[PDB]
Amino acid sequence: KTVVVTTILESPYVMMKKNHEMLEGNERYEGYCVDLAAEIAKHCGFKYKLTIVGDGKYGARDADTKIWNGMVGELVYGKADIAIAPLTITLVREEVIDFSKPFMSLGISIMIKKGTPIESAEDLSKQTEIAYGTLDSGSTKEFFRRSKIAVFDKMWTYMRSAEPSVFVRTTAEGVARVRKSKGKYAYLLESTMNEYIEQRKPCDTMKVGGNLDSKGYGIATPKGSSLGNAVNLAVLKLSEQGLLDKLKNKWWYDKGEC
Amino acid sequence: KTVVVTTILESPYVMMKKNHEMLEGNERYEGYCVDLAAEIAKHCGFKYKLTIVGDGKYGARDADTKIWNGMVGELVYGKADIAIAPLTITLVREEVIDFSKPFMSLGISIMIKKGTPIESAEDLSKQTEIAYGTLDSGSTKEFFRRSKIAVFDKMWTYMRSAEPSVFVRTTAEGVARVRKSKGKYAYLLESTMNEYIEQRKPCDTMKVGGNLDSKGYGIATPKGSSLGNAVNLAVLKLSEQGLLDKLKNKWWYDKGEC
Amino acid sequence: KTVVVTTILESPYVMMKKNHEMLEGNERYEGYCVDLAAEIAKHCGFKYKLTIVGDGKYGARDADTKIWNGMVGELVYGKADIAIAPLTITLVREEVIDFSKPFMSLGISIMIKKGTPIESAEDLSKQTEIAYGTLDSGSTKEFFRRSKIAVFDKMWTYMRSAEPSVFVRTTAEGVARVRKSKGKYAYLLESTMNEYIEQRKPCDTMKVGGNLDSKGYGIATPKGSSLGNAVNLAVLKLSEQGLLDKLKNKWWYDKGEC
Ligand SMILES: NS(=O)(=O)c1cc2c(cc1Cl)NCNS2(=O)=O
Numbered sequence: 001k002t003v004v005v006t007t008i009l010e011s012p013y014v015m016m017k018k019n020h021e022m023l024e025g026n027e028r029y030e031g032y033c034v035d036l037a038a039e040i041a042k043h044c045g046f047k048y049k050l051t052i053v054g055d056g057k058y059g060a061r062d063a064d065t066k067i068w069n070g071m072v073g074e075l076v077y078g079k080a081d082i083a084i085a086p087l088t089i090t091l092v093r094e095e096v097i098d099f100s101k102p103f104m105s106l107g108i109s110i111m112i113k114k115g116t117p118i119e120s121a122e123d124l125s126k127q128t129e130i131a132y133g134t135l136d137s138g139s140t141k142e143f144f145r146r147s148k149i150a151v152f153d154k155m156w157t158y159m160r161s162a163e164p165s166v167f168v169r170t171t172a173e174g175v176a177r178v179r180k181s182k183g184k185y186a187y188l189l190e191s192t193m194n195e196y197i198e199q200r201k202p203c204d205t206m207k208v209g210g211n212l213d214s215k216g217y218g219i220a221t222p223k224g225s226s227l228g229n230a231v232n233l234a235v236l237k238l239s240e241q242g243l244l245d246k247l248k249n250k251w252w253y254d255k256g257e258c
Numbered sequence: 259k260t261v262v263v264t265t266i267l268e269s270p271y272v273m274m275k276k277n278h279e280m281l282e283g284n285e286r287y288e289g290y291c292v293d294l295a296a297e298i299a300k301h302c303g304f305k306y307k308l309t310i311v312g313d314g315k316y317g318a319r320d321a322d323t324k325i326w327n328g329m330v331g332e333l334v335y336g337k338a339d340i341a342i343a344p345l346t347i348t349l350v351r352e353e354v355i356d357f358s359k360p361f362m363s364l365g366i367s368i369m370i371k372k373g374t375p376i377e378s379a380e381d382l383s384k385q386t387e388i389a390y391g392t393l394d395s396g397s398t399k400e401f402f403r404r405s406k407i408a409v410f411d412k413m414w415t416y417m418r419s420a421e422p423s424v425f426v427r428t429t430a431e432g433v434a435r436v437r438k439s440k441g442k443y444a445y446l447l448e449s450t451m452n453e454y455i456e457q458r459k460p461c462d463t464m465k466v467g468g469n470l471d472s473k474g475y476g477i478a479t480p481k482g483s484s485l486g487n488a489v490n491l492a493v494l495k496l497s498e499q500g501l502l503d504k505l506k507n508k509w510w511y512d513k514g515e516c
Numbered sequence: 517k518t519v520v521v522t523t524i525l526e527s528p529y530v531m532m533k534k535n536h537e538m539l540e541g542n543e544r545y546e547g548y549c550v551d552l553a554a555e556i557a558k559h560c561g562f563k564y565k566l567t568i569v570g571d572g573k574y575g576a577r578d579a580d581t582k583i584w585n586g587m588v589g590e591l592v593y594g595k596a597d598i599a600i601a602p603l604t605i606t607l608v609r610e611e612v613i614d615f616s617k618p619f620m621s622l623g624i625s626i627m628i629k630k631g632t633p634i635e636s637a638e639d640l641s642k643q644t645e646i647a648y649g650t651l652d653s654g655s656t657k658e659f660f661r662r663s664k665i666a667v668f669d670k671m672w673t674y675m676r677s678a679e680p681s682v683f684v685r686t687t688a689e690g691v692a693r694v695r696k697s698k699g700k701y702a703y704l705l706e707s708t709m710n711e712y713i714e715q716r717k718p719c720d721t722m723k724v725g726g727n728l729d730s731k732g733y734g735i736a737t738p739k740g741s742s743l744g745n746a747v748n749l750a751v752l753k754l755s756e757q758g759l760l761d762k763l764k765n766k767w768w769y770d771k772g773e774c
């Protein structure tokens with residue numbers, strides 16, 4: 001049985017090859033998570049098919065219908081065997097799906113346009129001239145919605161009722177907004193994506209401050225799935241052999257344009 | 259039924275209180291893991307007894323007999339219900355015990371006496387005047403033993419054969435050897451412990467270079483244990499609520515002496 | 517009865533003619549082995565149908581299931597009557613299928629990006645900056661796995677545990693890997709394929725050093741198949757009539773682009 005892999009188009013984890021339409025199957029895609037999937041499958045001894053999640057979301061539970069969307073939804077409702085993506089390990093997700101040990105570490109961070117008068121979250125919360133927001137339907141938004149820490153609680157109170165909305169549908173949208181807002185918009189996003197963008201032309205954004213928190217991306221499988229064990233062991237093995245470090249360098253830094 | 263907790267005396271995770279002589283049971287101890295254990299037991303709803311692992315080791319497998327020692331052995335042979343300590347999540351351990359999601363990140367790092375002409379692992383490998391080693395029966399030693407990476411491979415070849423031994427029984431002994439070697443001994447140990455010691459009198463050691471790898475500490479339980487599920491969720495909860503960050507600051511930086 | 521010929525897409529042995537993807541039967545393909553199959557069929561007096569091996573592999577035996585894949589498997593399990601491809605004559609294969617006398621000689625050799633500081637296998641083995649690998653599921657990989665020769669043994673020890681995998685799925689993937697790795701990847705492959713690629717645009721690769729061994733390609737038929745005798749006699753006749761040399765010139769050197 002070919003394993004169905006749900007993933008998401010997010011640079012540099014999964015990207016369309018410049019010549020996608022003249023290629024087929026897995027060959028259309030490239031990136032950190034494409035390289036990671038290849039190995040995981042090799043070490044676990046399975047065949048797979050990469051598929052981009054339909055709604056383009058990571059995964060959240062609708063408060064009304066209680067239905068899970070995104071990659072999480074694909075696993076919960078039996079559409080996918082495994083998720084290989086920058087999917088954050090969280091308590092609410094861990095209750096409905098299984099995660100491997102983290103294959104990459106990260107934290108919520110601040111992306112600003114270079115020269116923006118902001119050095120930290122506390123700085124953001126103490127002012128109003130500079131707008132700020134997060135990705136919609138992600139772990140970053142939930143972190144702010146749920147936090148009991150004063151600075152973050154305050155930031156959430158502003159963001160949830162700010163208008164027009166400070167939330168974006170895609171990371172790309174968030175970055176575009178920072179770049180076009182002449183320093184009047186700051187974007188809250190995971191450090192890994194912040195670091196990648198920082199190394200790309202036009203080289204006009206920058207990560208400021210330390211991270212607001214600390215967590216990991218995990219490879220996800222449906223609850224109680226037989227894949228979980230092998231996949232978890234493969235991540236540990238690839239970690240120890242230095243593969244993850246190698247892949248980070250290849251897709252983030254070896255490529256640097258700034 | 260009272261949960262038997264195995265742990266190890268390692269600053270600032272688990273330390274004897276100054277007035278321990280006049281205290282009983284769990285009260286004799288303090289530190290990050292002592293606080294973590296309390297919250298873990300609170301959220302999982304159990305009573306526990308802290309016990310210091312007899313052989314004072316983290317845990318490795320004897321190549322000849324194939325018996326596990328240290329905290330890993332205690333779990334493997336049914337002498338303990340759970341290990342709450344700076345126990346590194348690794349592939350060989352994960353094959354015999356269960357680990358929670360990481361409660362703390364770290365990497366292998368170099369500790370030197372201030373002023374020592376060393377800036378990196380690569381440096382250490384290119385010279386012979388300055389001896390270097392690691393802790394016996396730990397994940398660090400195993401990291402060098404199993405490493406295919408050129409610089410590390412070379413470092414192991416030198417360590418596994420040097421006389422007198424460059425290996426130490428405890429972290430305290432390793433640190434003491436740095437402090438009294440007049441810069442002729444550098445110690446390879448985890449960045450967490452390195453960073454702690456760097457902030458303590460006589461303030462004569464230093465962490466140099468970056469981390470040689472990236473991994474995590476997990477709470478361990480015997481394979482297939484019922485405790486495992488509840489404990490894992492508890493770690494995720496404590497991470498998200500920010501308690502883990504609070505504990506780190508309390509035990510590492512709030513205390514700073516240098 | 518129409519003889520079912522199993523073969524594999526490998527330049528310049530068998531190739532899809534430009535714009536023939538939709539066309540019918542044998543006309544679709546061109547190459548050394550297409551010309552060879554024609555002569556063989558003529559001299560043995562049979563009709564045939566060319567088919568491309570389903571899994572795109574040459575043939576190896578799964579250590580776990582003990583099942584043969586690729587063209588070898590097609591013959592072993594009765595899916596095909598004969599294999600006409602750059603199939604290496606080896607001991608493990610000769611035990612389960614029959615081979616004609618060789619129609620072409622070759623050896624394992626090194627392909628590098630022009631300017632790479634490597635002259636020999638020994639060179640490869642004494643350094644770590646430049647990675648190297650081979651095709652998966654082929655006789656080249658098995659040569660290294662089995663060798664008791666010091667240099668090749670040392671190469672296998674590195675290759676079998678390197679991450680990411682140094683092994684490639686197809687010859688084209690290995691070559692693509694050499695061309696894009698800026699001299700950091702050397703590909704081990706059979707000299708005939710290496711010499712072909714050397715004369716093709718972009719003309720940026722090179723064969724270096726001598727061959728590591730010496731062997732031949734044979735036409736393969738199922739054990740005890742009647743076709744065997746006549747096919748073997750046919751190969752010898754083609755060889756003595758100079759037709760194999762003619763075909764070599766036509767598909768390697770008459771074509772040269774560099
Ligand atoms: N920087 S990170 O790998 O170490 C990290 C990841 C997770 C935590 C805590 C930390 Cl410091 N909580 C448990 N789940 S998680 O997102 O993998």
Ligand SMILES: NS(=O)(=O)c1cc2c(cc1Cl)NCNS2(=O)=O
Nearest residue numbers: 101104105239347363472473474
């Ligand atoms: N720096 S760390 O917490 O994030 C980390 C820990 C582990 C990994 C990968 C990373 Cl980046 N592999 C899975 N097991 S582990 O030792 O907890």
Ligand SMILES: NS(=O)(=O)c1cc2c(cc1Cl)NCNS2(=O)=O
Nearest residue numbers: 617618619620621732751752755
């Ligand atoms: N270089 S050589 O051994 O491979 C070779 C030997 C014979 C041929 C053709 C070649 Cl290229 N004809 C078939 N019988 S043979 O004399 O062993």
Ligand SMILES: N[C@@H](CCC(=O)O)C(=O)O
Nearest residue numbers: 058086087088138139140
């Ligand atoms: N990695 C996040 C998405 C990005 C973000 O929330 O900033 C998740 O799994 O939901």
Ligand SMILES: N[C@@H](CCC(=O)O)C(=O)O
Nearest residue numbers: 316344345346396397398
């Ligand atoms: N944390 C390590 C011990 C310290 C070290 O190896 O440096 C372990 O779990 O084995």
Ligand SMILES: N[C@@H](CCC(=O)O)C(=O)O
Nearest residue numbers: 574602603604654655656
């Ligand atoms: N000719 C080889 C395939 C190519 C290689 O292994 O290098 C074989 O028959 O297996």
Ligand SMILES: [Zn+2]
Nearest residue numbers: 297300301501
């Ligand atoms: Zn609590």
Ligand SMILES: [Zn+2]
Nearest residue numbers: 533536543544
């Ligand atoms: Zn035609």
Ligand SMILES: [Zn+2]
Nearest residue numbers: 039679680681
């Ligand atoms: Zn691998």
